[PDB]
Write a protein that binds this DNA or RNA. Structure first.
Lengths: 237, 115, 50, 77, 101, 68
RNA sequence: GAAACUCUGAUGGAGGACCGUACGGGUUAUUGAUGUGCAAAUCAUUUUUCUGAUGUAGGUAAAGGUGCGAAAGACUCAUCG
RNA sequence: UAUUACAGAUCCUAAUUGAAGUAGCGAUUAUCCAGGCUUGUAUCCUGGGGGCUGAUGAGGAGUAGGGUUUCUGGACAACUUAAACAGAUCCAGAGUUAGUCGAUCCUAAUCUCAAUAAUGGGAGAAAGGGAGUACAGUUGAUAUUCUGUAACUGACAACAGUUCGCGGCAACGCAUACUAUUUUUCUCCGCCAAUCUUAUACCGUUGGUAGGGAUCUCUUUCCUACAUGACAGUACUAAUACCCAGGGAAACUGGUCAUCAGGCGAACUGCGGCGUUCUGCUGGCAAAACAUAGCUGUUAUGUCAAUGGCUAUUGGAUUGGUCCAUGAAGCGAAAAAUAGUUUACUGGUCACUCGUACCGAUAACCGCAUCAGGUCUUCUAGGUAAGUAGCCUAUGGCCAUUG
RNA sequence: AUCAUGACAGGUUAAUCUUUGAAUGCAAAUUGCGCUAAACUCGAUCGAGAAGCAUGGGUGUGACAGUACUACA
């Protein structure tokens, strides 16, 4: 057999991110001990990422490409800190914020940059305050103990509802993955011959083998549904 | 007549730097003359508009010109146009005047306890 | 060419001054006959590969 | 398809003259295939023992080295 | 700062070596150079391949006692340098060429 | 190559110790042009045949004058 | 026309729209010519596409049980299960 | 004593038959007649017919590649499917001139060392960025490189004369330093569509004068020619963008090809401000160049006047649309602000290094070759027509092709 | 050039020793881009050439860094 397209993404020659026109890494300023006001100089769109970024100035002018909540405008004053009040814009630690509210770009570790809840039209919800660890629900469903000192932007991330509209033409998806990375178009494994992929070969196109494989299964062998505790139509539940 | 004319410079291709225009000489011969590049010249920060009272030439040949024609006379002469400078005066006055009146306020309010 | 480098031009010089008939007086001196100049060529037939 | 027509656009040069070898210096990869420049050691293998002795000592002038052979004749004769 | 305990290379060379006489090799004998002497008042010479126009202008002056106006510098298909040296208006290029012969 | 309107300003430019020659030259409409050479520029002076005679005298004696 | 709105004509210039040029990109048919070729894959007539998932140049990245592949076991210097 | 005896191995190497004076001498417009040079030409040159190519041309020029194929003279043993005095062949000489065109300098994708007391250094584009040149003349071959004439840019020197901040309500104007820090701008950016307009080409209505072509008859005819470079200046005409002063808008007004604009201040008035284009008038500048006429190198006249484009290309201006697509960086340059130190401005010498000839497929590149193949780009005439189609023809180049 | 003031295709040793290469001032498909107390040599105080300047490690010499250890203040 040959090495399979799933294995070949590691070696990373043509399968690298197209990172040329990307404006910078989206994160907070570092922590550095109250309250600090910060004007939104402008809000710009970087390629690949569906969200906007908003370039702040903590005037020297110290810059920070923070990811943009919805309802931010140019020449708003954003207020990072503990004793900053509640507006959509402001960047509070999880000690201060009320529970049962939608927050954006929340950090895992303090002073980190921002980790959970970054893509367009997403938000971490806050469940409740234990003592040190403010428990929050992530967009998927999963729940996470996160320390109260670490920061999070208030409100929902901008650019919501982009997949509501379908892309009618193959050309629209060509321009989508030009900004991101080469991973498209996908040739299906059944169509390929036996050497190229596991599902390939045979007189008539069909999978033949069970098509559902363990965590223990090797490189080359992990193809199709990996460790699928259910399959088929998820009716109810 | 044959009015066709060669490129003189040894670059073949039709890039932005290698562009030509046909011109009649003194000798009745058509010939390539090469186009110098366009310049936008100084726009402003805030809004993004053309300031007046300066030519769009190259900034290198802006040095060769007189110090008069490089600038506008006001404070923030080149960088900011007129009405944006008016707004900076009004705000930077009344930000400082409110802060100065705050020092008058916290002087005046605390004196009520003594009397 | 044009736009040759200098050390490219050095090789093309040496390749054309070496290209000539053998002199008459060596056959008169040594008395050997049938010696050809090895670094003779023609431009059209054999390329240099330098 | 793969023959005469596709020989047409063959104008770029893969290899260029090499400083140490002077002979096949790879422009993109920057290495002399024949001699291994710029590795400080000079390339030879025992599977090409024929091709090595074309390059190796004796082939050139030996300006310093021939006079040091000639001393050792005189001392032992 | 550095200061060695002895000279390393003690022996200085005997003469200049890179001389005025060995910059300018000698004049070129062609039909083109014959016209440029008579018409334009402009000599021609074979030159050292590393010699600059600043080196040639000074070296031409020291030998023949005439300061040149311009020097323009070919490297030929024979890979030796050719220097078109324009003399000034007062001197004639035939009169300098007759001295050399 | 600039032109100079006033005959007075021409004679200021003539007496700089830059200028190598002036050239007299007949023109259309029975005019004439006095072309002062300078190291940088060539200053021309168009004039009518009323004041043609006086200007030549005005020019400095030292400067060479080439008639055409 | 009570209204909500909808009839006629112009304006406008959208679209992986259409016809159609080339020393452009492809290569359907004649199973034509050639098959001791002009050619170790060509020629003629016909045919397809022609603002795009377009063509193309230079530089640059990926190397042999590997690479790359809108997948034909295709291609990797006339060489490839 | 042995590298010891050949008819075979689709044996190895070297030479050679028949087939055979046979197959065949292709593709590319088309050749003909008189002269010149010769032992000898349909072929090499001249002149005159007849043709072809028919602005994506076997036209004029360049990247990549080739490397002397370029140029002059002499030569024909061979080669250029016959011939040859010819030739990209052979032989002997000769030829490539730059401060302004390129390289050099900067970084891109990307590659490679070093430090971690570090926060990087170096490489990487002859199509990106990038200060600065034009005309005319000249050679057997070089020219934006040489000569003449006119510019321009940078760096390093002193030195002479001016000058120690003012105008406008405002938009802004006019003669002003340097070091540093920070901030901003120019450099500077996708694709598509529309309108307006310089320059160049072309077609036009009005005439004209110079030469040449045509003529049995007709044609106040037909053809050629009617031109001004970089660079520098300052008039008022008249534009659109944007801003300023007054003005203070529904009976809504103004405006585009189209969308539109306006109390966050419209129409409208200023001999407003300013940027970019425009017309005219100059300098350069007729001294050059070109065409006639005459004299033996140079003297004469002349290159004029009026005014359209519904045509095209190019540069620019004013805008719109489109994207789950938002369309380089760096060196460098100027400005501004805040400190501190202050007088400034205008007006001789020098400019290193390396490339530079010619081809660019049509015989000069890659295909073993002077191969109907393949290979990136540039300037692009008239008529027919919707036309960068097909067909025909001036300028230019040709008869490539055995009889 | 000849009975020598000694011919030259003889043989050693020593000079001179171009651009390179371990290649070594920093690079390189570039004749690219640097730096220097004196002395040296032309050039008439101040330019140029000539000749220097690599990395790693050894011994010595010097200088800097440290809330590392310690004494005396």
């Amino acid at each position: 057999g040959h090495i399979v397209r799933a294995q070949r993404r590691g070696n990373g020659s043509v399968f690298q991110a197209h990172t040329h026109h990307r404006v910078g890494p989206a994160k907070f300023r570092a922590l550095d001990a109250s309250v600090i006001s910060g004007m939104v100089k402008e809000i710009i769109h970087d390629p690949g990422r569906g969200a906007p970024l908003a370039k702040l100035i903590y005037k020297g002018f110290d810059s920070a490409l923070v990811i943009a909540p919805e309802g931010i405008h140019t020449g708003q004053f954003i207020k990072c800190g503990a004793q900053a009040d509640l507006h959509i814009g402001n960047i509070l630690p999880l000690a201060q914020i009320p529970e049962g509210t939608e927050i954006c770009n929340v950090e895992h570790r303090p002073g980190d940059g921002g980790r959970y809840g970054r893509c367009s039209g997403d938000s971490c919800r806050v469940i409740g305050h234990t003592e040190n660890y403010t428990r929050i629900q992530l967009p998927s469903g999963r729940k996470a103990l996160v320390s109260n000192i670490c920061r999070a932007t208030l409100g929902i991330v901008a650019g919501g509802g982009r997949p509501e509209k379908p892309l009618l033409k193959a050309g629209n998806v060509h321009y989508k993955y030009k900004a991101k990375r080469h991973t498209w178009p996908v040739v299906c494994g059944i169509k390929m011959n036996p050497v190229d992929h596991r599902h390939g070969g045979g007189s008539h196109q069909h999978m033949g083998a069970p098509g559902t494989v363990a965590r223990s299964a090797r490189p080359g062998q992990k193809l199709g549904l990996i460790a699928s505790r259910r399959t088929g139509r998820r009716r109810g539940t | 007549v044959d009015n066709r004319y060669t490129l003189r410079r040894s670059l073949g291709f039709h890039t932005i730097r290698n562009r030509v225009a046909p011109v009649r000489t003194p000798g009745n011969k058509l010939v390539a003359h090469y186009i110098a590049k366009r310049q936008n010249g100084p726009h402003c920060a805030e809004t993004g508009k053309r300031i007046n009272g300066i030519k769009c030439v190259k900034t290198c040949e802006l040095r060769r010109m007189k110090k008069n024609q490089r600038t506008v006379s006001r404070p923030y002469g080149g960088v900011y146009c007129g009405s944006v400078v008016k707004d900076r005066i009004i705000n930077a006055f009344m930000e400082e005047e409110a802060r100065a009146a705050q020092e008058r306020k916290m002087a005046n309010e605390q004196k009520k306890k003594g009397k | 060419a044009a736009h040759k480098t200098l050390r490219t031009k050095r090789i093309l010089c040496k390749a054309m001054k070496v290209n000539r008939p053998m002199p008459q007086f060596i056959r008169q001196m040594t008395g050997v006959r049938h010696i050809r100049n090895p670094l003779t060529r023609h431009w059209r037939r054999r390329k240099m590969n330098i | 398809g793969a023959g005469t027509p596709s020989f047409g656009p063959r104008h770029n040069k893969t290899h260029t003259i090499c400083r140490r070898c002077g002979n096949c210096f790879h422009i993109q990869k920057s290495k002399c295939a024949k001699c291994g420049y710029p590795d400080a050691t000079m390339r030879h293998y025992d599977w090409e023992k024929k091709a090595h002795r074309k390059r190796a000592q004796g082939s050139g002038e030996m300006r310093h080295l021939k006079v040091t052979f000639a001393k050792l004749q005189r001392a032992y004769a | 700062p550095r200061r060695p305990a002895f000279e390393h290379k003690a022996v200085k060379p005997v003469s200049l070596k890179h001389n005025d006489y060995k910059i300018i090799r000698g004049p070129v004998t062609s039909d083109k150079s014959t016209v440029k002497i008579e018409n334009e008042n402009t000599m021609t010479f074979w030159v050292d391949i590393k010699a600059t126009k600043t080196e040639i202008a000074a070296a031409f002056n020291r030998l023949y006692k005439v300061k040149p106006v311009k020097v323009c510098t070919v490297i030929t298909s024979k890979f030796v340098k050719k220097a078109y040296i324009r003399l000034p208006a007062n001197v004639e290029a035939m009169n300098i060429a007759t001295e050399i012969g | 190559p600039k032109q100079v309107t006033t005959p007075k300003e021409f004679l200021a430019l003539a007496a700089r110790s830059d200028a190598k020659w002036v050239k007299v030259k007949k023109a259309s409409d029975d005019n004439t042009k006095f072309k002062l050479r300078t190291t940088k520029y060539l200053y021309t002076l168009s004039v009518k045949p009323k004041f043609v005679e006086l200007v030549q005298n005005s020019i400095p004696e030292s400067l060479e004058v080439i008639v055409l």
